[PDB]
Design a binder for this molecule. Structure first.
Ligand SMILES: Nc1nc2c(ncn2[C@@H]2O[C@H](COP(=O)(O)OP(N)(=O)O)[C@@H](O)[C@H]2O)c(=O)[nH]1
Length: 256
């Protein structure tokens, strides 16, 4: 029955509400090595709900909360990740959701605060979002107990690996140098995550270097060949990311 789930999401997106709604008062606040942990029953599982520190990005010195959240997702202790998303500010919240899907980690998106999005004249299309993200999207109003118990626990029991859908289309030189960096990293890290990490290093992420072994030292040489192939490598990563995120927001969002 054991199943470890990690709630992940932006700050002020109804994360603690959803955590509390599922856990109730079956919680244990301790400390990493604040670590918040909870328990709740499903049909097929008894879940260990690991609350993670709220963050906008798995990349960036910043606070200690940001790092532990990032490291936990890479650690791979969790079977499933439930990503609490604010529906009223989708674009802003999707950047973390993209990173989780780029890491290839099985996850369910808890699309929350839909009533606020509805009040702001925004009707998000659930099936369209699920199709383009490649993971179950559960519409929610976390504050309503009637709504939270509707399907979420049902979705948790039938979870699978994400659909291998196309997300960000980076230029080939970026994928080349990210792959070269990925070959230097320890092989126990999945190849799909090693390439993503390599790309974060090129953009100038401070965290990703930790999982790279000695690949972090080969950065400037890769950046040199990138800087002669394009004006700036870090920007081109950020450009391609935007069109992906923005293209999802367009086809998924509508007038109520
Ligand atoms: N209207 C609405 N409000 C919500 C919903 N979920 C959470 N909230 C409200 O948003 C605020 C922040 O919620 P919280 O869970 O603390 O977010 P956090 N800090 O990311 O854990 C709270 O005042 C809460 O009542 C929702 O689905 N709909």
């Amino acid at each position: 029955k054991k199943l470890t789930i990690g709630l992940i999401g932006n700050p002020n997106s109804g994360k603690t509400t959803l955590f509390n709604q599922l856990t109730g008062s079956r919680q244990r606040v301790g400390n990493w090595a604040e670590r918040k942990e909870g328990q709740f029953s499903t049909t097929d599982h008894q879940v260990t709900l690991v609350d993670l520190p709220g963050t906008y990005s798995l990349t960036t010195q910043t606070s200690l909360d940001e790092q532990i959240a990032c490291h936990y997702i890479l650690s791979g202790d969790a079977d499933l990740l439930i990503n609490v998303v604010d529906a009223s500010n989708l674009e802003r919240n999707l950047y973390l959701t993209l990173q989780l899907l780029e890491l290839g980690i099985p996850c369910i998106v808890a699309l929350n605060m839909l009533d606020i999005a509805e009040k702001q004249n925004i009707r998000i299309e659930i099936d369209a979002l699920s199709a383009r993200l490649g993971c179950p999207v559960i519409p929610l109003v976390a504050t309503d107990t009637k709504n939270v118990q509707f399907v979420l626990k049902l979705a948790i029991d039938r979870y699978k690996a994400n659909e291998n859908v196309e997300l960000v289309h980076y230029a080939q030189p970026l994928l080349n140098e990210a792959d070269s960096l990925a070959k230097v990293m320890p092989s126990d890290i999945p190849l799909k995550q090693r390439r993503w990490l390599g790309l974060q290093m090129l953009e100038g992420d401070i965290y990703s270097r930790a999982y790279a072994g000695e690949a972090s030292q080969h950065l400037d040489a890769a950046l040199a060949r990138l800087r002669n192939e394009m004006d700036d490598p870090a920007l081109h990563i950020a450009d391609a990311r935007y069109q992906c995120i923005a293209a999802i927001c367009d086809v998924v969002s509508n007038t109520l």
